[PDB]
Design a binder for this molecule. Structure first.
Ligand SMILES: *[C@@H]1O[C@H](CO)[C@@H](O[C@@H]2O[C@H](CO)[C@@H](O[C@@H]3O[C@H](CO)[C@@H](O)[C@H](O)[C@@H]3O)[C@H](O)[C@H]2NC(C)=O)[C@H](O)[C@H]1NC(C)=O
Ligand SMILES: *[C@@H]1O[C@H](CO)[C@@H](O[C@@H]2O[C@H](CO)[C@@H](O[C@@H]3O[C@H](CO)[C@@H](O)[C@H](O)[C@@H]3O)[C@H](O)[C@H]2NC(C)=O)[C@H](O)[C@H]1NC(C)=O
Ligand SMILES: *[C@@H]1O[C@H](CO)[C@@H](O[C@@H]2O[C@H](CO)[C@@H](O)[C@H](O)[C@H]2NC(C)=O)[C@H](O)[C@H]1NC(C)=O
Ligand SMILES: *[C@@H]1O[C@H](CO)[C@@H](O)[C@H](O)[C@H]1NC(C)=O
Lengths: 321, 172
């Protein structure tokens, strides 16, 4: 009459199915989720500086549309553009809009430095009822609409050297009148021209006269351009009509700044990872919330769940029912 | 699994064992009982914590990237932007799928392995005083009181003490 000693292992009543090399589903005692599939629906206000655009796109804040004046000199880690944003100034386009938005978003600042341009023989500070400032006509705060003085618009030829140790971003434009009457009334010459250059590059834009769709009282347009001037280089602006002049430059930076389109509300909490759906935790290595992210984020995958086994094979007793 | 213990020569697991992952059940003249083996349990848990911590190791932080949704039809540049992102996502989705498959196969095999290590260790401890029944149970051919069982489980069982007794019961 001896003894028995049996070796064994545990099991649990409610195991979990996982995938392996040989099995698409096999039961283990426990597992843990590797895909973050939920958000709170809110963008946490820390630790990144979030700037809510509210009614303004980044470009409208840049140009200085009056209802975006509150964004003057603002900074951000993440600029958030809302679907409710609208423009309310002179109608405009930006050839390569996406690039200008990108480079400004990435610079992370709208810090503007006014420079003393001398515009000899023209009238400055033109305004329009399309772009009201208080009760009266106005214009983009960062741009200077030049027109004839008396009965002449001379050749404008000005320079601004960059003697700082940082890059300057100049935003300028060209006016496209809708009629010949408008062209000659404003600029005298029947056809204008704008040439903006540095030592190594140049942009020449010829205005086109013609109607575009009526927007906020104008069939005319302004087209927006930009020029970066590096330390030791120089800006020259040359025009015999249609120049929408810069008032100065934006200071460029490099760093971690970006921009995101989202309607998620901003809330008081801390989250490294931001998506357009809201912040998400970053404890898991993968996520299926949104391919668009900012910060220390799990990597986007197509799977909505992936289970990492955290226990042995779950083998319950052979069932008698 | 590769070692043939869990879901193998051991018929099933024990729902009753709630204080460890592997362990011992016995019958002797004083009755029957159960005890968890801490060392095997901890070896499995440590390996699983190790792989879990490697997998969740935060390694990526990105700031300004490319746009991934578009309000206008543009053609060539947008086709490329979308294809770059779609390509990336498929490659990462594959990495994730493969990772869990390999990890999980290995977790099953390592847990099976630890069961087997405990069984082989126990067998070695018992030398000639026991026989492998083939279902994870040793028939012990001598009087093994509770002090004797605990001696096997805590690594102090001297097989010489019981050898003559056991050898005799075996070759009769
Ligand atoms: C088996 O693994 C599961 C994971 O699939 C474990 O569930 C997780 O357990 C942890 C620790 O108890 C929970 O963390 C805690 O969450 C609460 C919020 O409810 C928080 O207040 C605590 O500070 C802590 O972070 C976690 O929520 C839970 N997750 C899920 C999805 O259930 C479970 O503990 C494991 N069980 C065994 C026996 O190993
Ligand atoms: C339009 O305005 C620009 C900007 O001021 C004028 O450019 C300047 O033109 C003068 C020559 O007319 C350049 O002077 C030269 O400088 C070199 C280097 O110092 C010197 O060695 C020469 O003897 C000569 O004096 C000056 O450098 C140049 N400056 C810039 C920034 O371009 C341009 O002449 C004006 N054009 C008209 C038609 O008025
Ligand atoms: C996060 O937001 C995305 C994008 O808005 C959601 O996906 C969209 O909504 C449904 C998904 O069932 C679809 O009709 C659209 O095609 C999706 N759009 C895109 C661009 O993929 C997504 O479901 C949200 N996820 C969470 C967890 O809130
Ligand atoms: C913006 O910043 C510059 C200097 O950094 C300053 O000269 C200017 O007055 C500021 N304007 C506003 C509106 O803050």
């Amino acid at each position: 009459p001896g003894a028995t000693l049996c070796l064994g292992h545990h099991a649990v009543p409610n195991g979990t199915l996982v995938k392996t090399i040989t099995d698409d589903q096999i039961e283990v005692t426990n597992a843990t989720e590797l895909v973050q599939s939920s958000s709170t629906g809110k963008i946490c206000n820390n630790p990144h500086r979030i700037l809510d655009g509210i009614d303004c796109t980044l470009i409208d804040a840049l140009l200085g549309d009056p209802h975006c004046d509150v964004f003057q000199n603002e900074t951000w880690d993440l600029f958030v553009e809302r679907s409710k944003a609208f423009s309310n100034c002179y109608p405009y386009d930006v050839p390569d809009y996406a690039s200008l938005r990108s480079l400004v978003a990435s610079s992370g600042t709208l810090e503007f430095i006014t420079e003393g341009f001398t515009w000899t023989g023209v009238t400055q500070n033109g305004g329009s009822n399309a772009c009201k400032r208080g009760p009266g006509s106005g214009f983009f705060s960062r741009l200077n609409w030049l027109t004839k003085s008396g009965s002449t618009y001379p050749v404008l030829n000005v320079t601004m050297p960059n003697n700082d140790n940082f890059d300057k971003l100049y935003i300028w434009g060209v006016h496209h009148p809708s009629t010949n009457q408008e062209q000659t009334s404003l600029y005298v010459q029947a056809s204008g021209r704008v040439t903006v250059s540095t030592r190594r590059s140049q942009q020449t834009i010829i205005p086109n006269i013609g109607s575009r769709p009526w927007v906020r009282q104008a069939s005319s347009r302004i087209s927006i351009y930009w020029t970066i001037v590096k330390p030791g280089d120089v800006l020259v602006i040359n025009s015999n009509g249609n120049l929408i002049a810069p008032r100065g430059y934006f200071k460029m930076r490099t760093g971690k700044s970006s921009i995101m389109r989202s309607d998620a509300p901003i809330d008081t909490c801390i989250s490294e990872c931001i998506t357009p759906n809201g912040s998400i935790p970053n404890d898991k290595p993968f996520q299926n919330v949104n391919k668009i992210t900012y910060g220390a984020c799990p990597k986007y995958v197509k799977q909505n769940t992936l289970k990492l086994a955290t226990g042995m094979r779950n083998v319950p007793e052979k069932q008698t029912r | 699994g590769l070692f043939g213990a869990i879901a193998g020569f051991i018929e099933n697991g024990w729902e009753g064992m709630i204080d460890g992952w592997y362990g011992f059940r016995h019958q002797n003249s004083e009755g029957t009982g159960q005890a968890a083996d801490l060392k095997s349990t901890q070896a499995a848990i440590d390996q699983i914590n190790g792989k879990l911590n490697r997998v969740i190791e935060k390694t990526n932080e990105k700031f300004h990237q490319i746009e991934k949704e578009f309000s206008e039809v543009e053609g060539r540049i947008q086709d490329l932007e979308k294809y770059v992102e779609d390509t990336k996502i498929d490659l990462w989705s594959y990495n994730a799928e493969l990772l869990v498959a390999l990890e999980n196969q290995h977790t099953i095999d390592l847990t099976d392995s630890e069961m087997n290590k405990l069984f082989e260790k126990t067998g070695r401890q018992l030398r000639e005083n026991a026989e492998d029944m083939g279902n994870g149970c040793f028939k012990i051919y001598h009087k093994c009181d509770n002090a004797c069982i605990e001696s096997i489980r805590n690594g102090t069982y001297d097989h010489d003490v019981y050898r003559d007794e056991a050898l005799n019961n075996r070759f009769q």
